[PDB]
């Protein structure tokens, strides 16, 4: 299973909009949960994004795809975004599912310049 992440690069304007797409390709495992993480340039340690406000996420478990949309863009949004799938893992005894860290996206390098 690999995570097909598009676009790979976005150069955007303050106030505009951005839609990152991720598709779980070659998955035998059902999508249970999703995660998004950014590396702002300056840092390289990866912050877990908080979905809410300008950050709106759509998950379709059926087609194992999922997407972020960032609206009204700010310069503080600049950075490399990566989505990640988390799989449900049934155990051959109980009824409860384990979570299983999936593969990560290759990334989206976003830039939100103003008048430059």
């Amino acid at each position: 299973a690999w995570v097909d992440q598009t676009p790979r690069t976005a150069t955007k304007e303050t106030g505009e909009s951005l839609t990152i797409n991720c598709v779980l390709r070659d998955a035998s495992l059902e999508l249970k949960d999703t995660g998004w993480y950014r590396t702002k340039l300056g840092s390289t340690n990866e912050q877990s994004i908080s979905i809410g406000g300008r950050y709106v996420e759509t998950v379709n478990k059926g087609s194992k795809s999922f997407s972020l949309r960032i609206s009204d863009l700010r310069v503080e949004d600049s950075g490399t975004y990566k989505c990640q799938a988390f799989y449900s893992l049934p155990l051959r005894d109980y009824n409860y599912s384990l979570l299983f860290r999936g593969e990560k996206g290759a990334g989206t390098a976003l830039t939100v310049k103003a008048a430059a």
Binding site: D26, G35, L91, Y94
Partner: protein, 335 residues
């Protein structure tokens, strides 16, 4: 006047406190949050060759899945229960085929691959937990075993003394390098992808660790000498005296705050939700050895004497009656 050392690059893998960075005998060098509660877990950067866990009151081995549920015998072992599809144990090739879609991961050596794999099990549905489970890889099998229990020792004499009035039961164990563990390696979540060149593995034939002083390799000033019939016995002792993150203040009747101190996370229906917490005199840590211990041994095959030490060695002496060994090394293998 030159203060440098032409051995420095060679001996870097024997600077165990820097390359490994955690306990060896008992590794619990990091804390991680899981569903709002901090637990201890293994965090050494180097594999531990020969290492497993002995269960004291049971006949069940530690690579047997954990308990409650009809399957691998009685009070269970330490390993992950069967999933669908089975994720533990996984063989080398099964593992490579799983991560075929990932360039970096599919090509990892068998040991970092097992560590990475083990690191994909999420603890307790906390999708964002930094907490990753350790693993044991069996080189005879090619099987990677993920460990659900990260604890390495619970066994004070007054509850755990062997099959006889212990007070009787619930879980006595200790890490060991037993002969039936020779093909095993103990892997934290942090085993580095290049351990093969920065970490110890094979013992050094015809070599004695020394200290570089004044452009000469001198004997280790301060050693403790033990009898040992063979190299295997020396390594067992070195391992026994090595870096240890065990709450090396032993507990009585097991309390919740001290269950977690030992690396436990669950009671197998919920977590171990300790609601007191150490905010006073700790620094949230006092049992992290960060690799400080008697991690090195000079085995003299003539005198059958294990010479064991607690400072990093900075050069090697050529001596045909010696074998240089470390707590991390394979207990038998020599180069």
């Amino acid at each position: 006047n030159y203060m440098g050392n032409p051995w420095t690059e060679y001996m870097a893998k024997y600077d165990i406190e820097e390359v490994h960075g955690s306990g060896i005998r008992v590794d619990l060098g990091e804390d991680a949050e899981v569903a709002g509660t901090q637990y201890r877990l293994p965090s050494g950067k180097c594999p531990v060759f020969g290492k497993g866990i002995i269960i004291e009151n049971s006949n069940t081995t530690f690579l047997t899945p954990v308990a409650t549920g009809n399957q691998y015998l009685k009070d269970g072992g330490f390993a992950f229960p069967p999933t669908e599809p089975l994720m533990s144990p996984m063989t080398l090739d099964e593992m490579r085929h799983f991560y075929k879609d990932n360039k970096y991961v599919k090509n990892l050596d068998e040991l970092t691959l097992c560590s990475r794999h083990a690191g994909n099990m999420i603890p307790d549905n906390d999708k964002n937990s930094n907490y990753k489970y350790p693993a044991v890889y069996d080189d005879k099998d090619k099987k990677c075993h993920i460990l659900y229990i990260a604890a390495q020792e619970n066994n004070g004499p007054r509850y755990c003394n062997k099959d006889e009035s212990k007070r009787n039961s619930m879980f006595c164990f200790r890490p060991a390098k037993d002969i039936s563990f020779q093909n095993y390696t103990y892997l934290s979540k942090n085993v580095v992808d290049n351990w093969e060149k920065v970490c110890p593995r094979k013992n050094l034939q015809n070599a004695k660790f020394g200290l570089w002083v004044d452009g000469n390799c001198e004997d280790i000033p301060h050693v403790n000498e033990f009898p040992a019939i063979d190299l295997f016995e020396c390594n067992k002792l070195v391992f026994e005296l090595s870096a240890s993150d065990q709450p090396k203040q032993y507990e009585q009747h097991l309390t919740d705050y001290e269950k977690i101190k030992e690396g436990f996370k669950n009671k197998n229906a919920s977590m171990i939700k300790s609601a007191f917490l150490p905010t006073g005199a700790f620094k949230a840590d006092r049992y992290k050895s960060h690799g400080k211990g008697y991690n090195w041994g000079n085995y003299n095959t003539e005198t059958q004497k294990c010479e064991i030490f607690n400072v990093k060695p900075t050069c090697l002496i050529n001596n045909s009656s010696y074998i240089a060994t470390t707590a991390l090394s394979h207990p038998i293998e020599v180069e």
